[PDB]
């Protein structure tokens, strides 16, 4: 008898595994706080979304379309579609890596096989409903057992872990990139559009269960970060271990669990990865359907939407795998998480605005403290994103670009795009678009 949840499954995508492995292998227990803040954020926002439904009976998508003009709503839909595609790129890459580990076929073979097997997975999901729940619970239990055993064998320094987890510090540009990647992979803005739908059907105990699921997911994520950080860094390593830790794709993870599985970790880890990727795709299909059916009301079959998303995701993932090997796929997973974090504000600002706005939410209002905390966190996230973007662009421009004829054009284009992004965020933030009500 286990009252499991699907939120932790969405928090254990291959994107989360890749971002956690990178954070642990590049900054030891330095970005643990991002996992603590992100989760604390990711839960809080979700709560608001759920509460919105209970107070309105309509998804965030319907309200966003109703209270905004045609062009703003179209741009929001484009942002949501980009968010779903960026989420679905890691699933394809995760499953391709699982196939590479298991059947010893190249990564592009994995991506092609995942495109072929999306239909079979959809059919299986249609056939069984509790079997999927048991599969996700068993996968979560396997990941928890494997990583907790690995952690116990490792025995890291508790003082250093606490100092890294409760003392935020983005010590370096690379740390900023990995912190943004972790925020993207944990916050996952598109899920808001999905989560509201989960309450369209019709809570201290429900909140307690959600908090338990989130605590399990956060414990697993912290365990992955700590295990990667301790094993990759340690004090003395074999040259092979250092070379594997340098890149550390999603297919070199088996090196992590070798202590607690004994050279048999390849099969178990590949199975865990494949199950996690497939389950994340299953969950995100509903989110894509809800986005499509809310932002424009254009009804689309779930299987058709899933096929379109998987093809659009395979295009770039397959191109990257062909041009670059597993390291390229890892870079693409991190980039997809970064894009998710970057475009989270567009799907988060309307939620907070509608929660505050008494007109749309009616007499019922969310707790002022939670709304203020969410607003402050969202503003901090936007500022960190903009600072990292300006940082990387400036460093590229100052000395990394040789030509000068196109330097002015590139600078103008980048400044125009950044100004448009900031102007859109400011329009959505310090401006009221309220021409409706409950």
């Amino acid at each position, epitope marked *: 008898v286990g009252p499991g949840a699907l939120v932790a499954i969405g928090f254990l995508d291959p994107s989360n595994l890749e971002t956690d492995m990178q954070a642990g292998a*590049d900054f030891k227990y330095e970005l643990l706080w991002v996992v603590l803040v992100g989760m604390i954020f990711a839960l809080l926002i979700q709560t608001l979304a759920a509460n919105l439904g209970v107070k309105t009976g309509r998804h965030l998508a319907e309200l966003c379309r109703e209270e905004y003009p045609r062009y703003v709503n179209i741009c929001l839909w484009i942002i949501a579609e980009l968010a779903v595609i960026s989420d679905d790129i890691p699933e394809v890459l995760g499953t391709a890596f699982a196939f590479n580990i298991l059947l010893k076929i190249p990564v592009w073979a994995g991506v092609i096989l995942t495109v072929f097997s999306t239909l079979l997975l959809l059919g299986v999901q249609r056939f069984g409903a509790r079997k999927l729940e048991f599969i996700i619970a068993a996968f979560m239990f396997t990941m928890a057992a494997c990583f907790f055993g690995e952690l116990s064998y490792l025995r890291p320094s508790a003082k250093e872990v606490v100092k890294g987890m409760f003392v935020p*510090s983005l010590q370096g540009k690379g740390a900023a990139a990995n912190a943004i990647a972790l925020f993207g992979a944990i916050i996952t803005p598109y899920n808001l559009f999905l989560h509201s739908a989960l309450v369209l059907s019709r809570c201290r105990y429900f909140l307690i269960e959600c908090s338990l699921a989130f605590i399990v997911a956060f414990l697993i994520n912290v365990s992955v970060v700590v295990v990667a950080g301790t094993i990759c860094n340690a004090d003395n390593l074999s040259p092979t271990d250092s070379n594997t830790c340098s890149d550390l794709t999603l297919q070199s993870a088996p090196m992590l669990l070798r202590n607690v599985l004994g050279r048999s970790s390849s099969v178990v880890y590949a199975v865990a990865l494949l199950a996690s990727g497939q389950s994340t795709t299953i969950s995100c299909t509903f989110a894509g359907q809800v986005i499509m059916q809310g932002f424009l009301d254009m009804k689309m079959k779930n299987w058709v939407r899933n096929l379109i998303t998987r093809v659009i995701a395979i295009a770039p993932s397959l191109i990257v795998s062909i041009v670059s090997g597993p390291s390229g796929a890892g870079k693409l997973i991190i980039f997809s998480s970064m894009v998710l974090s970057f475009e989270m504000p567009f799907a988060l600002i309307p939620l907070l605005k509608f929660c505050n706005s008494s007109k749309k939410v009616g007499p019922l209002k969310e707790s002022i403290y939670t709304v203020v905390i969410a607003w402050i966190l969202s503003f901090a996230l936007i500022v960190v994103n903009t600072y990292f973007l300006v940082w990387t662009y400036v460093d590229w421009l100052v000395h990394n670009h040789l030509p000068k004829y196109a330097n002015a054009l590139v600078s103008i284009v980048v400044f125009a795009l950044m100004a448009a992004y900031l102007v859109f965020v400011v329009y959505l933030t310090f401006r009221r678009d309220t021409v409706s009500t409950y």
Partner: nanobody
Amino acid sequence: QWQLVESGGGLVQAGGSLRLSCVGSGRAFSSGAMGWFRQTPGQEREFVAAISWSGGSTVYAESVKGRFTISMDNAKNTVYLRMNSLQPEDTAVYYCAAGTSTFALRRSPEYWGKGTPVTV
């Protein structure tokens, strides 16, 4: 041009206090980590120190800790290593190195340097 150029060290007697400066240009190194490595006449390269852009991240080598103070000037994009209480065991060629974080530089430095000999 893009390069890293260690400068200093020379030769000292003991408690050398030698203050080695690594200057990097052409790739904007002072955003991840800018650390050092050492290699004795016959041996493999070893970690000596590192520092991140934030300023407090210095991770040292258990062989030498509390004697080397590493500071980073971001604006000039330079990494300074102060060696105090020097000893014969530290005789070696020192290589500046730059990475993507103060721990990745611990293992695989993206960019290396020619290095300078420090003899006691």
